[PDB]
Each structure stands twice: as structure tokens, then as C-alpha cells.
């Protein structure tokens, strides 16, 4: 109930304050990568980022209000989208590159080591460029990420609270844009442009899941028990 009383600024501050930290990849030069090694590194990294996401989620205003099983559903539905939008966000200042970690900055040629990762790589890159051209603000980004969390699994339930929360975040986004001096028209246009990108992030996630499952069945690199559990929820 608490989350609905927050002003737009309180929502923004709460979301910023809850941001997870930027992690580092297992170090070591040894260039270039092989399919196995690169997959090893990314898997280990994704697994540790997950743990932080799960604690970031609990700090998403109103997320704790949900029952456990409802929290599980949203996270199982949205986890890869959430990792993806985070990866894209921190890659913005690195056009042409994906910053998986400060010590793991990759270009598409490096992503060709792994079977069909370049497909997703190019989509993630396109998302980054889109964010850059729009000049996505950190305040907007955090709103987008929580929206993803609350929305992606909402229609696979059986939800009124969640929607009220989503509305609260819409007000927060508009609130932000108004401050930037954007006129009414510019405000709803930007709002839509932002939300439409969520449809592509969903697309990338779906394509991504299929490839992870493929890697699992291929059994080239052991996935963590957590990743496995998050993955199996999508099958």
C-alpha cells in the first residue's frame, strides 16, 4: 500500500537508491575467447547479476506488497528482459560495444564465437543506439526497468494493485519529462517511444531464452542451478 502515497520525486529517489551495483567479470587476459570460455564468463556474470536483481526487486516500491508466489512469477517472467535493459543502459556511452562489465567490453565480432549470439548482440546494440539518440536519462531508465518487472508477467496470472503501481510509474515518467521542459505533446510522444522499446526488449528476451535452452541441451557449459530454475520457468 505504501508505494501509492509516494510523490513522483520520492518514487524516483527510491528507485535510484535501489539500483544494483556494476559487477566485474572473472578477470584474466587470454585473448581471444573460445565459445566455451566466453560462455563461461557471461554465465558466471549473469548468475551474480541475478542475485542482485532479486534484492533490487524487493526494493521496488510496492513489490514487497505482493505475495511470494506473485513475486516469483514476475521475476521468472522478466529476469532476462531486466538483465538486458541493464546491459543496454550501461553500454550507452560505448557505441558499437556492449559493456557486460567494466573489464569486459565486447564488440559484435567477439560475439561470433558463440553460436547465434551475434543475432541478439546486434539487437542489444540497436537498443543502445536507440537509447542514445533519445538521450535516455537515468531517472527514465529506472522507471522503465521497474515497469518491465511489474508488467511482463502481469497477464499470465489469473493484479489490480500491480496496475495501480504501473500507473504510479507512468505519472513519474511524465513528471520527469515535464521538469526537463518538454511540452505536453513532446511528453506523450516520448512516453510512447519509450514504452514501445519495451516490446523489442521483450522480443530480445524471447529470442534469448531459446538460445539459452539450446546451450543447456547442448551442455557445452554448465549453467548455475539458479539460471536453470529461471530458465525452466519459460518451458
Amino acid at each position: 500500500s505504501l508505494a501509492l502515497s509516494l510523490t513522483a520525486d520520492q518514487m524516483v529517489s527510491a528507485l535510484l537508491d535501489a539500483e544494483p551495483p556494476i559487477l566485474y567479470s572473472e578477470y584474466d587476459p587470454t585473448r581471444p575467447f573460445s565459445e566455451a570460455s566466453m560462455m563461461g564468463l557471461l554465465t558466471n556474470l549473469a548468475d551474480r547479476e541475478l542475485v542482485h536483481m532479486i534484492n533490487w526487486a524487493k526494493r521496488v516500491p510496492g513489490f514487497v506488497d505482493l505475495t511470494l508466489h506473485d513475486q516469483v512469477h514476475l521475476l521468472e517472467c522478466a529476469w532476462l528482459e531486466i538483465l538486458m535493459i541493464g546491459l543496454v543502459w550501461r553500454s550507452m556511452e560505448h557505441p558499437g560495444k556492449l559493456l557486460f562489465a567494466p573489464n569486459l567490453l565486447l564488440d559484435r565480432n567477439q560475439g561470433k564465437c558463440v553460436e547465434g549470439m551475434v543475432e541478439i548482440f546486434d539487437m542489444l546494440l540497436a537498443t543502445s543506439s536507440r537509447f542514445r539518440m533519445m538521450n535516455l536519462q537515468g531517472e527514465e531508465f529506472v522507471c522503465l526497468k521497474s515497469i518491465i518487472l511489474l508488467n511482463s508477467g502481469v497477464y499470465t496470472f489469473l493484479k489490480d494493485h500491480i496496475h495501480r503501481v504501473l500507473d504510479k510509474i507512468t505519472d513519474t515518467l511524465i513528471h520527469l519529462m515535464a521538469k526537463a521542459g518538454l511540452t505536453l505533446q513532446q511528453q506523450h510522444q516520448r512516453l510512447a517511444q519509450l514504452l514501445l522499446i519495451l516490446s523489442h526488449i521483450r522480443h530480445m528476451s524471447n529470442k534469448g531464452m531459446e538460445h539459452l535452452y539450446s546451450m543447456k541441451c547442448k551442455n557445452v557449459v554448465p549453467l548455475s542451478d539458479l539460471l536453470l530454475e529461471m530458465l525452466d520457468a519459460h518451458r
Binding site: 542475485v51 526487486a57 511470494l68 521475476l75 530454475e229
Partner: peptide, 10 residues
């Protein structure tokens, strides 16, 4: 029985 269950409990 979910790992996700544990991480959310904590």
C-alpha cells in the same frame, strides 16, 4: 522448492 524462494525470503 525454489532457490528463488530462498533469495526472496532473505
Amino acid at each position: 522448492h525454489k532457490i528463488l524462494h530462498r533469495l526472496l525470503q532473505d
